[PDB]
Every structure is written in structure tokens, then in C-alpha cells.
Amino acid sequence: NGMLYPQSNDSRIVFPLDGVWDFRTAGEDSYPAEWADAPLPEPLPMAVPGSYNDQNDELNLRAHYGWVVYQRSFAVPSRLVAGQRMILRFDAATHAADVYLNGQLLGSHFGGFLPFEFDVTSALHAGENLLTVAVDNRIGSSTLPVGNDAGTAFMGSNVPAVAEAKKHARRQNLPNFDFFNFAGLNRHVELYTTPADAYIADIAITTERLDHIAGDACTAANALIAYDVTFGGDGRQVRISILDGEGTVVAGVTADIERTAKASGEIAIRDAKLWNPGAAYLYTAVAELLPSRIIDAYRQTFGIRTVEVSGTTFLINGKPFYFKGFGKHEDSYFHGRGTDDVLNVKDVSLIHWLHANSFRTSHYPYAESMYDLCDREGIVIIDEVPAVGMSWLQYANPLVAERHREAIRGMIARDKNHPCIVMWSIANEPGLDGDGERPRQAYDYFRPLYELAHASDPQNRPVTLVCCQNDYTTDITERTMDVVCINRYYGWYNLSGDLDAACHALNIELDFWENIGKPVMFTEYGADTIEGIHGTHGEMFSEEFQRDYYARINAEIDKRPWFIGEQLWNFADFATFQGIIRVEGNRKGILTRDRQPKMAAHWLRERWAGIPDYGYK
Amino acid sequence: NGMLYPQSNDSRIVFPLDGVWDFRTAGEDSYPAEWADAPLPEPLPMAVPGSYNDQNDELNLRAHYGWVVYQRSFAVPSRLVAGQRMILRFDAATHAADVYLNGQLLGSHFGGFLPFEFDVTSALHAGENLLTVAVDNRIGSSTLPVGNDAGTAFMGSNVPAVAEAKKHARRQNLPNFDFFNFAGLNRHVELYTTPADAYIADIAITTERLDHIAGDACTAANALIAYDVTFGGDGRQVRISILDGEGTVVAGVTADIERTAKASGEIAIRDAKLWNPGAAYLYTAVAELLPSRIIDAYRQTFGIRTVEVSGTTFLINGKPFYFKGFGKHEDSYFHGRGTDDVLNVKDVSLIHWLHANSFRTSHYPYAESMYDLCDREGIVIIDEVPAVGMSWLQYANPLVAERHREAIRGMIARDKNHPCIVMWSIANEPGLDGDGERPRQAYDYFRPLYELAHASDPQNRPVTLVCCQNDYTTDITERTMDVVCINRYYGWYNLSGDLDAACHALNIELDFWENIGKPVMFTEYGADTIEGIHGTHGEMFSEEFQRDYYARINAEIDKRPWFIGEQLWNFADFATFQGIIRVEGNRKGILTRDRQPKMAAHWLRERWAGIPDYGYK
């Protein structure tokens, strides 16, 4: 269950397997298994980590349907593997993968946005090893994210010629979502080692209680934190040291390991330095398994802070927080969905430049490094599983339910220790409304997932579901979330270009949510905007209209004390499937795809500069 | 002298140090020494490998002048360093660096585009190590590439207000070159191990002779290759096995090591499979130092092919080659000059898409991985040192001369084994013409560098100097190169917009080069072009004008049998210092900065599809 990011220390080494691999496209529903037995014939180069789709302009890999096969060789010193447990970890293979080492199938995985690993201790041998990874890009009615088994894509555009032509068209992934289906080895691949006899398998750190939080929330007189360390392998003990920002041990305990091996307990820290948005502070929990050498160790970063929904407020360290930010995407020009830490570092700086304080991982868990980055940079995150494109067809499918539970458990197991994460999102824009039994069916599907998210998170953070612009009067699910997160496009997708009418409609629905009495925030709202299109009276697609859009809508939500956040759509223009409403993709970015600020970004920067993280409402 | 890329095998391990480091800007001519002794205070995140300049939009790091300081911690298992030689390698730190480990100065380096390394065997210790790297971005009259000590920039735009304001302006780097001065840890950083007592320090493989090359140049009846293995450390022997593309041992010898410890010899390869443009074939030379636990090994890729200038022809494997391609840059939106193998892979695919066969590393050696990529993809390279912006002020400067020799020796030492490299360039557009002694001074400066390039390369490839559009009648240097490489902008920088006149002037200079009797090629020609600007009669900056420009110019050089190549400027739009002729940088790319094809790219693709690598002229 534990998926601690690979670490190098005196007991452990990490051997990265990133670089330029060999690559071949394969079939729509199969690939030659014998490619695992020998070097790929006539291979293409393919960099990893990275989406494969934009890495070859001779081919049209964006149109590819089905399987591809990656391959590379590697060798490590015998003395490095000797006596060690050898683990091969894939940070992400999108969407499904079969992995072979030296011709042996290690196993398979389906989640396209969460890490998986294999014990390769016995499959490894001395000298060159052959690692073959088949990756499947297919989406459909039983995958998360959701594809369509027939028809059209998301927001897509009677005639007999059409029916016949459609029946013989080349097979394509038909996504029920608005972002391009970038596939492949999107995140890092690495071999790593642990001790074999006994080893640290998982660590969970929680902030249990804060006593006498300072007025500025910089410190608390006392902080009670809890630790939970799980072990694998096989009067044993683990030592736990708490290190402050300077590396000073400010607390330490030695705990007994009890048999499923586990050690758990609490630690009191006086004058604890708290983690806040805009003012990060990180401790390190060092776990050392006890017996020019010693034994196993792991260093787990964490931050001390509480999160609590109280009435219509969202309290971080007892202070009323206001979200400023956006949904993002892991999306960029050559990498596609490939992780890029240069871009992550830049984007975090841009979030500061904008005076935003938060974002949501729309619509899939992001690369782990981005959460570490936001931990140290004081940026708050809503962590979201790839459950986008869902409707009643999915709710009745047990395989989908299991994959959804897998995604929630996987995300929370991977990300539980990040102080920057303050809330979980269990879906984006599922079908929730309508008549007959449909609302009840949606509720019965999502409620146990809400409960699972609460049970899985030792910190017990709030849980939301990001809601589509729907009939809010027949939707009975969204109102039961801890925070109401709504996606609204009044004035863009309806009442188009009419901001007076858009504001009127918005205010009517806001009267509804006011009456609901839950804290509410925007998680999406915006307008496609082509940089350089200008007007004295801004029309749809102009920079001025995007600017006007946010000025009008935000003036309306400023009047509502129970409206605790504004996350717009989107941080930056991003790639989608082609279609009549997509001008080189989705253009609702306040930044261009190359991260350049449109007029609305400047306006928002000015607004957000005057809005404090705490106490705005 | 040897700088073999770090390799992992049974005798060696590589520990990458890439990732998100700590970072601070520092002073114009200094940095705080105590930053090397303890964790950086209030650090910024900075991804490495990458330029730092575009990784923080809160700061204006493009305007930064002077030093910055990088830092990170790392730990490796004691059992892995035990008894090993520990080397810390920097693939590139631009432009100069001081490196510290655990408070100790390891040493310094100048030269922003070639690797350097330090023996850290004694400076390393158990647990966390603190690695600090100060990086200097300053350029001036004694650096390569060349900066200006005062004035304005490359192609930059008496009045007392101006003189006085200039004297008090913020200090900035003033480039004598047309690409932005991206600085920092542009390429990978890694720790690696070798055996300590004796180890392989360098390998050189050369194609000495080909007997009876096949008609299609796919094979030769016999290939004589030579090996040269250098050792460090301290009846010893090294075994050398030659592996073909399938990993089959096709040849092998055991050689004696003699003292500077060295083994050298020749190997005949029967029915050798040759490396050609558009049809790569690679062998591996496995060098194993002879005495569980064994000794030392390194696997050196190579390709079997000859390069020979004969009269006005450029012969690869005895066949008359024609260059199709462009100058490139290592340049991209967030990385700056940072190496990005996703982008390298994509770019190589685009080179195939265009039906080009070559490029030049304008204006600095590229990341090593790109040469490996071109080795396997059959793309020919002209390898160039950062000697750009040079004039007579530099030729009289001993420090410049020494740095130039360092760049040539370093480049060739690093890159000698790549079959894709067919030619060295010792400078781009230096001052060579004029009256009095200036031409002779230039000749006396460059001739020994020409000679040095020939002496340093065991393959003895042709050597060129890429020549500025100058007075070809007083230039006495360019005509003495092995291949004449000219940069010409008739119709753009002069005879502006008049393609008839441009072609007339071109034909007059071509009449000059016709009599020189050297093979001649374009290494630059082009027109700034803003994608989306159109006209029925294309004017400067329109897509049509760029297209017309290449159509007319190329029609003229097609009439000259001695004109053996066309490399245009540039592959893709790239970042420059700001100025009145730079619209978001240099826009002479036939592709946009995001690698999208302008009209001229389609036209060129069509032309190049009909031009064979061999036998065009």
C-alpha cells in the first residue's frame, strides 16, 4: 500500500532509468510478445519521462490507437544488488502497462496517473538487462478517465452517408473529457534498493492537534503530531527523529515494532512552526529501523497544520482561508503530459507572480515532485483522481467502481503526507442531476467514495466533488460534500457574451447555495481567449472579454460571505482533441501555453494582490 | 583529457544529481563564501538541468548580471563508494563555475558548453553531503562566446543625455552574438564511480581504411579500424570486443598496456556494415581491463565510415555528399539553453520530416545525448566551438587564444567517436577582412587553430570556419579552410526585399568562389518571418517572402557543381537579447519556436524530398 518515493541514503540507492529508450508502435488491441525477448526491431528513439505523441512528426502519434512498446537495456554493479531487495518503480505509465524484464512478465497496471512497482530481485541478472514496457493508450466506458465506446468526443459536432462513413472510420479513442489523450511513460522510471530482511514500507505523519495558535499562525504553543510507520520483510525498534528547517533534532522517540509490522505513536512539539499558504515551513521525520554502517532509514518531509471545515468557513490553522487560483494541467509543447520540473518550478513562480495561493490537480494526480515543490513554496492543493467523464453507464459497472476506489486509495496513499494538500476531489463533472432514479443512483455511487476518501486519509481532510454546470435543483449529491466546488460558465456556454444576464443567473444560483449553507467555491469559470485579439468593447475570444468576464463575476461573488474561493479555468492554454470549439486546444488559460500573461492575468494579479490568504471573508 | 560519458555496468555506477535544487542570486562580481559552508538562506527552487533565467517570473533573471549559487544535498550508501574512485561530473555550467563539497573548494572551470569533473573521493563522507555550485554568467572581451566590455548589444540601436545616462546604467552582459545569454546548470550533473587502482580513462576509435566499398555503400569488403585506450590509476592487458548492431561479437583482440598507460592497435572487420546519412549503423567497442568481482569496463559506440574532401567534393564512404539542413540552437521556451531530450528526439524526427540530413551546432557544442541521437538516426553534424563574436581585439589577447584552444581540444576530445560528426568549425563569423595588416592578423590567429583541430582529431576530419558576409576579396583566411562555409543574407540585410538584385549579387560572389576550387556550402541564409503574416506579393516578415527567398536563392546555387550543401538559418525561432530587429527573438526559423512549420518549411520539405544524400552533384 505504501509507495514512498525512492530515496538514496546509507541503506538505499536509486538508479534512474530515464533517458532515450527504443520504441515501436504496435496494434490496436495487441502487440508482439516476442518483442520482450530481444531488442526491438527497427526501433525509434523516445525520451522518457514524456508523452510519446509529440515526439515524432514523421508519424501521427496523436492519432495512434492501442499499444506501443518501449524498451531499453541497463546494467548495475553486482555488489550494489548483492543482498538487497530490488524494486523497479514506474511513476506513471498512461494508461495501462505490461512490464517485462529479461523476457519475464513482471505484471501489469491500469491507473494512468499513479505509480506502480515490481520486485525484480530474482528477475535481475549480472550484465545487461532488457526492460520492455508495453503501454496501452485506450480509453472507453470502463476506464478512468472515461472514453466513449461509440459516437463523438467531448463537446463534439441523420444523413445516411454519415452513418455509413462513421461505421468504417478508423478507430480512435473517443474521450469524454476536454484534454488530449497524451500517453506513454509520462513520468520517471527508476530501479531502487532496500534492505531485504526488514525495511520501511510506509510512513504517515499527521497533525493531530494544535494548542494556542499564534495570531499570525506562524507558530503554535504546542503541536501534537502522530506517526505511523509500516515495515516489510521477514523486540525490534524504530527511532523517529523530528528535524526542523535547520536540521536540528527538536524531538525524538524510539518505538516498538509490533506484528503486519507496524510502529505508531504521538510526539509533542512546543513552539512548533506551522505550515501556511504563502509561508511554508517544513520538518523532516527521520525513521531509522534499529538492529561505517547501520541499517534502514527514510526521511519523510511534512508540515504542521490543521484543516477544518466549520460552518461556511475553511480553516487552516484556525484561520478563515480564501482560495485564489485555478485548475491546472500537466501539459506543455513537446512533453505533452510528461513531467517537466523546469516547467513546474516556473509555474510555481508564476503562481506567486499572480499572487494566487492554490490550484487543483485537474483532472488526475500530478507528478510527485510538484507536490514537494508546493510544500516548500506554500501553495495549497486540491488533489483530484482521474474520475472525469463519468455518468450513469459507469455507476452500474463494478469494474469502474473498483478502479475508482483504487484511484482514491492510491492517490491518498501516495500524497497523504503533503501539508500543501488541504482537500480531496473524488470526481470532475460527473452526471448528478435529472429525474427518476438518476440523482439517487449518482448519490449511491459517490457517497461510499466520499466515505472512502475520509477513511483513507489519516489527516481526515475535507472531501469534495467538482460539479458540472447542471440542474442544481435535482442534483442531490453535490450539496452533501464538505466543500461545494462548482464549475460555472454563465456568459460563455450560455447567455453567451451577455455579462448582465450571466451575473443575474449566477446570483440566482448563488441564492440557492446561500440557502444550502455549505462553504462554496469556484473550481472552474472562464472564457476562451486568443492573445492579440482586442476590442474597445470586448467580444468572446478577445482579451478584453476575458478580463471583463472575471471582473463582473468576481464582483458578484465578493458579496457572498459564504463563498470561500475562486479557482478559475484555466491557469494556461492546453492541448485538446481537435474540434470546432477548440482553437489549437483549450484557450481559457489566463496564460498562453508558453506561460505568457493575457490581459486578464494582469487584472487578476492586481485583484489577488489585494486579497489576503486569511480573513478576506 | 578523456571525458567519457559516465556509464553504469558491473564495474561502474552512475548516481544522477539532477532534480530541484536550492538557488540564490548573488552579486555582480562576488558571492558570499559562507553559502558554500551551510544551507543557502531563504533559497529559491531551481530545476537542473536547465537555464535559470526563465525559471522565475517573480524576478527578472534575464537581466541578471554576475553570479548565482546552486546548492543541494545528497547521500549514497557507504558500500557503494567503498574502495571506489568517486568523480563528480558537470556536463555544462554556463559560463564559469566554482564548485564546493562540504565546505571544501573542489575547483573551478571556465567554458559554458563542455563538461568538467572533480575527484571527490576524499571530500565525500557518509550521510548527507552538501554540494554548492556558484555559476558566473558574465561575458566580455576575453570570453568565448564574446561579450562587449562597453556600448550596446549585437545589432543594437553622441547626445550628452545619452552618454551620461549610459555611464550610469545598470551593468548588463553585452553580447557580441545573436542568441540570449542563457546561464546556469544547463546540462546534467552526476556522481559516478570507477575502480581506483586502474581504470579506463579514454577511448578513441577511428575508421582507418575501407577496401572495396559496395555500390550502395551499405558495406565494405574490409574495414580497418584503430583503437586507442588510455588508462588512469596506479603485464596488464585490455580485451577489446567489437559488437555489431545485434550485439554479436564480430571481432576481438587482447592488447598489452604500456606506459601514461595506453593500449593501441588495429582491427580488421570483414564485410563491415557502414554508417551513412539516412542509414545509420552502429558498432560497440567493449573495453575490458583484465586482472564475484572483476575489474573495469566501458562500452564505446562507433560507426564505420570515412570522410574525405576531394577537389570540390565532400566524400562520405567515397560518395559525393550534399548537405541539406540548417544551423540549430539549443533553445526552448522554459529550459532556455537547458538540455531536453524530449525536444532532441522531436527535433530529430522533424529533421527526417523535412528530408534534411544535417545540421551545425551553432554556436557551441551541444549536449552529448544529441550526438548519440544523431549517431543512431543518421543525421550528419558540423561540430562548432563557442568562438562567436570574435574580432581583432580578441586575436591579440593571450587568454582568448588559450580559451579557444581549450574549446577546440575539449570539443574534439569529447566528441571524436561520433560517426555523425563529419566536420569541425573553429569559429562563427569572426572578423577576417579589411585593409592593412588586419587580414594577416586574422590568418595568423586562425591558421594554428585549424592545425590544432586537425592534430586533435584521430579521424582527421575536415575543418572549416563559418564566414561572415564580408569583403571576400580581402579575406585571406576563409579560402584556406577544407570546406568553405558561408553565411549570406543578400536580399535581407542588404538589397533588402529585392530578390532579383540579391540573386545577381549572390551570383557575382559565386563567380568568385567558383575559381577558388574549394567545396563551398551555405551555413546560413534566411529571413525573419512572423507566422501568420501573409501577402499575395510577399514582403519582408511574411511567410511568402521567406518561401520566395529560399526558392530564388536555391535555384541559383543549383547551377553550381562545386556548391556541396545548403544549411539555412535557422531550424527554429529562438530567444535573443531584446532589440529593434528582434521580434520576440530571432524569427528566421523555418519552424516556429514551438516547432510548427511555416510555409517555407513545407516548400523546403518538398525540395529536399527530391534531393538525394549522394550524387546530387
Ligand SMILES: CCCCCCCCC[C@@H]1NC[C@@H](O)[C@H](O)[C@H]1C(=O)O
Ligand atoms: C448551459 C450548459 C453549460 C455547459 C457547462 C459545461 C462546461 C464544461 C467546461 C469544461 N469543464 C472541464 C474541463 O476539463 C474543460 O476544459 C472545461 C472547458 O470546456 O473549458
Ligand SMILES: CCCCCCCCC[C@@H]1NC[C@@H](O)[C@H](O)[C@H]1C(=O)O
Ligand atoms: C550587409 C551585410 C551585413 C553583415 C551580415 C551579417 C548577418 C549576420 C547573421 C547572423 N549570423 C549569426 C547568427 O548567430 C545570427 O542569428 C544571424 C542573424 O542575424 O540572423
